[PDB]
Structures are given as structure tokens and as C-alpha cells.
Amino acid sequence: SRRMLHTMIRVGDLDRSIKFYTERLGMKVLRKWDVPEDKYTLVFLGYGPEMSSTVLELTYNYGVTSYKHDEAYGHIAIGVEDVKELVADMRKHDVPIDYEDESGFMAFVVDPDGYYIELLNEKTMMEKAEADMKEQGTA
């Protein structure tokens, strides 16, 4: 028995990141874990607790104010009810919008540290995913 627990990203300004993931994406702070002896702080955020959800781990390294992104790591994707409305709320709050489709299926937005977040209409994505599994013999 195995489970995906979380994805970790490093952030330059911990409070700014927390504000984005909570106020703009509707996550809740689950817990924090400061390790001053090794000069870092962890915070876990998600839509439910780690015991029943896969969550986001932020790492702040003392004195490291910003990060450069490679061409390797992609993104996290979040399933939502209304992509158009959520994107509208992001723009209202000056979040960069990298991509927005016409139909409201998909968008990409940029977090305060420059990471990409994919927003998906959960209902449409799941219908598609199940359909493709059934076509490919995995469901």
C-alpha cells in the first residue's frame, strides 16, 4: 500500500506564497514545521488534511529570496468547478495569466515565485480521463 503524499516547491517569501495559495486558490494551511538549526521552514497546504489528501509543501530557506526555474519541472494541476470565474478573480488580483482557453476547460497561471499552476475543469477532465482509460484497456 502506497500513496502520493505531497509535492514540494521552494519559495522566496513564505507569507506571500501562503497568501496566494490560501486567498487565491482556496487552500488551507495544515501545519508548519520550522527547523532553524538547518535554516529552513516548511508549511503544508491543501484542500484537506495530509491523512486523506495529497498536498502542497512549501520550503523557505533562510536568506534565499528567489528561485530560477529549469525547463524540467512542469506544474501542479488543480481541478475546479469554474475555470473562467477563477481566472477572472486571479486577474482582478494581478496574478499573471499565462494561458486561458475559450471553453473554460484549462488555464495556466503563475504563482508569486514563478511556478506554473494548471487549472482544469474537474468534471470535464475526469470524464475525459475515464473515457481514455476505457479506450486504452485500463478501465
CB 27 within 8 A of CB 47: yes
Query: Within 10 A of 111 (CB to CB), how many other CB atoms are there?
Result: 20
- Mask of contacts with Ni ion, 4-33, x by CB under 5 A? ----x-------------------------
**CA-CA distance, 8 to 56, in Å (whole number)?**
6
Does residue number 64 form part of the binding site for Na ion (CB under 5 A)?
Answer: no
CB 56 within 8 A of CB 44: yes
Which helix H or strand E contains 100, and what residues bound it?
A: strand 97-100
Among 28, 66, 101, 130, binds Na ion (CB under 5 A): 66
In the complex, minimum distance from the CB of residue 77 to Ni ion, in angstroms, rounded to a whole number: 4
Give 101 or 130: the residue with its C-beta nearer to its own copies. Answer: 130
In the complex, minimum distance from the CB of residue 116 to Na ion, in angstroms, rounded to a whole number: 13
**CA-CA distance, 84 to 135, in Å (whole number)?**
29
Q: Pick the catalytic residue: 37, 85, 100, 118?
A: 118
Q: Catalytic annotation on 118? A: yes
In the complex, minimum distance from the CB of residue 96 to Na ion, in angstroms, rounded to a whole number: 12
What residues are designated binding site for Zn(2+)? 57, 75, 118
